[PDB]
């Protein structure tokens, strides 16, 4: 019933762009228990549930074409590389697992590296550049890697959980910038933009009260859309600040997806109120819309 993943086909004629949702039954639905899904373009979508299988999905057949799997354990994130292709998929055991998307086949290619602590469960990824990766962790750390060599760049460690109870900052969502910096949407409500050349933080914007589960940037690097375990989304503008926050949603917001083409620059959010809800990017322009 609930949303767990949204993705647009492109993000930039009659070019077939489509919208791919993942419904918490296990379903997938496309507009004009699954846990993640991406597209690939150079266009086919890949999804994971909680099990270790990462599966393609043929659309005109509407059947699970070309399953893939592996040894390690539960995939909790994956993503595709940009151009100057593979997949990177981080799991519970601290492995990050590269899958090959050589021309048509989805192969279990290679496990590059893994954290020494088994108690570091990865949560999300985003790609700072072509060949180097940003991954959140179940501890306070988010961490960079290189896939040319597999190596482990600087741990970008967040603090403790000050507000009460737990110790660990569980980083639920990580995204990137065209500027070269990376936003980390952690637990405890906060967001923080980390610098990209030196991999340290530069700003720690506290807006939400409960953990930001998802966020997404504009395609020009201008507006940042966060969405939390509260009923709350919030926008950010230029180093940065927030503008406002309206409870568009009714449960926690669980998945964002932005699009900036065809004269229709919209960002679509979904959570656990079973109601996908679409926003413009020009947030002072006009109202919003929702679809069920």
């Amino acid at each position: 019933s609930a949303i767990n993943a949204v993705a647009f086909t492109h993000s930039a004629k009659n070019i077939q762009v489509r919208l791919a949702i993942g419904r918490a039954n296990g379903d997938i639905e496309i507009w004009n228990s699954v846990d993640g899904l991406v597209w690939v373009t150079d266009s086919r979508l890949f999804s994971i549930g909680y099990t270790t299988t990462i599966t393609e999905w043929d659309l005109e057949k509407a059947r699970a074409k070309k399953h893939a799997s592996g040894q390690h354990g539960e995939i909790w994130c994956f993503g595709v590389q940009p151009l100057p292709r593979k997949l990177v998929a981080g799991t519970v055991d601290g492995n990050l697992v590269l899958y090959s998307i050589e021309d048509g086949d989805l192969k279990f290619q290679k496990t590059l590296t893994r954290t020494p602590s088994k108690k570091t469960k990865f949560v999300s990824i985003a790609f700072q550049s072509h060949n180097i990766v940003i991954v959140g962790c179940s501890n306070s750390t988010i961490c960079a890697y290189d896939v040319r060599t597999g190596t482990m760049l600087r741990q970008m460690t967040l603090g403790t959980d000050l507000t009460g109870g737990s110790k660990n900052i569980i980083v639920w969502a990580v995204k990137c910038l065209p500027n070269g910096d990376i936003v980390s949407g952690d637990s405890t409500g906060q967001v923080c933009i980390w610098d990209g050349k030196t991999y340290t933080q530069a700003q720690r914007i506290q807006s939400h009260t409960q953990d930001v589960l998802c966020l997404s940037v504009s395609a020009d690097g201008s507006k940042i859309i966060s969405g939390g375990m509260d009923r709350r989304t919030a926008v950010y503008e230029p180093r940065w600040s927030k503008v406002f926050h309206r409870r568009y949603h009714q449960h926690d917001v669980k998945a964002m997806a932005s699009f900036e083409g065809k004269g229709m620059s919209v960002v679509v959010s979904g959570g656990s109120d079973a109601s996908p809800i679409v926003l413009p990017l020009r947030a002072l322009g006009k109202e919003f819309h929702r679809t069920l």
């Binding site: 700003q203 720690r204 914007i205 506290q206 807006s207 503008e237 600040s241 927030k242 503008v243 406002f244 926050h245 002072l284």
Partner: protein, 284 residues
Amino acid sequence: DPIFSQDERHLIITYNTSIQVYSTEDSLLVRRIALPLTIVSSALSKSNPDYLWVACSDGRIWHINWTSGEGVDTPSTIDTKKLLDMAVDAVLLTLNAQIIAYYDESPQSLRSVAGGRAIVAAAKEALHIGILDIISTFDIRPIDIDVAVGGARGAIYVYSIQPRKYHWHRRAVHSVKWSGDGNYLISGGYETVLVLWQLDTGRVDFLPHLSAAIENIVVSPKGSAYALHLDDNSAMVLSTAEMKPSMYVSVVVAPQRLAEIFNAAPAFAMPPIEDVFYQVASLF
């Protein structure tokens, strides 16, 4: 509307009957200065002196000072309607429905922007910038300008096109001012809490419990003490990070390397001393 002195130790308060100056360091009132009603504003004179400027509800321009009682005799009535708003610069300008200086909706207030001048006019939802939500109050900082508008609700829009909502207050805001170096946005409210907006890393930290009184706050001439006007007929000079009222008003070379210059080839068969001297001076 309360105002400090150029040398910080004097506070300045207008009442509904007179003008009273105060010692920020030691005690209560210094001068009962006569100011009849047979009140719009009071600021300081800008360029050379620090006398005063008081405007009453109709045109009677008091140019009056402390350090004396001089100025109790000379008003001015060059304007015909009852005066609404008042601002000085350096050069006086008065809002009457429009300006007179030296338009659709009802006027609210009018403020002046420093030496390379600009004007900021204030109707309900209009605001007029002049180069050369329903409003309640607003402040400003230059250097090229930034305007923080409060509201009849608890939304504090910030402008540098798009505002920023800084909504906290569970009623109208009564006071919004920029702090010092512009890092914080010190705001007040009806509900006795003096909120410090962080405006950096977007946190809030405040002074909650007080005499049910917050309206018309002012900031020190330095980054120091904020003075609060207070609706229980009280002012309160609070120094900063105390949040405690200060005023209530109611050649080193090891020898072994030169030994190593002279160890091998004992006296004869040693290199010639031009070369040995180049070894020694090259060591030094």
